[PDB]
Amino acid sequence: HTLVWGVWVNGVDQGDGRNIYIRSPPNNNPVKNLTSPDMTCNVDNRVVPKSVPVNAGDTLTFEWYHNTRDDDIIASSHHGPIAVYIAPAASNGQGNVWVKLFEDAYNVTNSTWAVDRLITAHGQHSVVVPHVAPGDYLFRAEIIALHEADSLYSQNPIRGAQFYISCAQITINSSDDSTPLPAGVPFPGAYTDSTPGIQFNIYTTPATSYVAPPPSVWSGALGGSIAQVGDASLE
Ligand SMILES: *[C@@H]1O[C@H](CO)[C@@H](O)[C@H](O)[C@H]1NC(C)=O
Ligand SMILES: [Cu+2]
């Protein structure tokens, strides 16, 4: 159970984004049905009034929370990976449009899942904005919680992988378009019952065997991190 509060651009808080530049759902419940249109941008996908301006090369930070800003972020049990995708905003998320910018599943050194590190980061994880064409984009941040993923939702709807999905409206102003955006994958559609990483037993299988769901990260992606960039208690 987790939601996005807002974003930071180069370490500067853009302010409460809920239903303003985040297409916020009503609550922090997971999406579980892989074929549902809710997989795109969660249960209340509509255009909201603002878009955050950024330039290529900026650091765009998502900030998640559980019930209130800068709380426990998400239950420790919800181990799983984090990914960020981008699509042109005009698609409204439909079609083969989502390109993956970031993936973090299990870091073998630190012996932590992406979610565990997100808690330590006070809910913050970032991507560097890529050199795509100026215009309006959706950034889709996705957490997969695996603690009931030994079952498939389609077989047993009280269990299954849990998807926490948030779409932010981002306007890219200045970019040299050195890496124009390719075609991507559809949501719903990219993940099926047989996709690696959707069904997994975290209690018996060692995390070093986990493979996160495709697609792989685009070669035009400029990186990112799970790491606190600003202190919500101050700004
Ligand atoms: C999943 O969503 C699809 C598409 O809306 C729907 O047809 C199907 O009934 C849902 N599955 C379950 C198990 O509720
Ligand atoms: Cu939860």
Numbering used by the authors: 1 to 235
Provide text from the study.
Lytic polysaccharide monooxygenases (LPMOs) are copper metalloenzymes which cleave polysaccharides oxidatively and are important in pathogen biology, carbon cycling and biotechnology. The Lentinus similis family AA9 isoform A (LsAA9_A) has been extensively studied as a model system because its activity towards smaller soluble saccharide substrates has allowed detailed structural characterization of its interaction with a variety of substrates by X-ray crystallography at high resolution. Fungal LPMOs are some of many enzymes secreted by fungi to break down plant matter, namely cellulose, and release glucose. LPMOs randomly oxidize recalcitrant crystalline cellulose, disrupting local crystallinity and creating new cellodextrin chain ends that serve as additional starting points for the endo- and exo-activities of glycoside hydrolases.
Here, the joint X-ray/neutron room-temperature crystallographic structure of carbohydrate-free LsAA9_A in the copper(II) resting state refined against X-ray and neutron data at 2.1 and 2.8 Å resolution, respectively, is presented. No residual F o − F c electron density was observed for an alternate conformation of His78 flipped away from the active-site Cu2+. However, residual F o − F c electron density indicated that a Cl− ion from the crystallization condition alternatively coordinates the Cu2+ ion instead of His78 as observed in the structure of LsAA9_A previously solved at pH 3.5. The occupancies of His78 and Cl− refined to 0.75 and 0.25, respectively. The N-terminal amino group is neutral. The distances from H2O-eq and H2O-ax to Cu2+ are 2.1 and 2.7 Å, respectively, confirming that the copper ion is in the resting oxidation state, copper(II), and validating the use of the X-ray data for joint refinement. In the structure presented here, Tyr164 is positioned in the axial position of the copper with a Cu–OTyr distance of 2.80 Å. The Tyr164 OH group forms a hydrogen bond to the side-chain carbonyl group of Gln162 with an OTyr164–OGln162 distance of 2.72 Å.
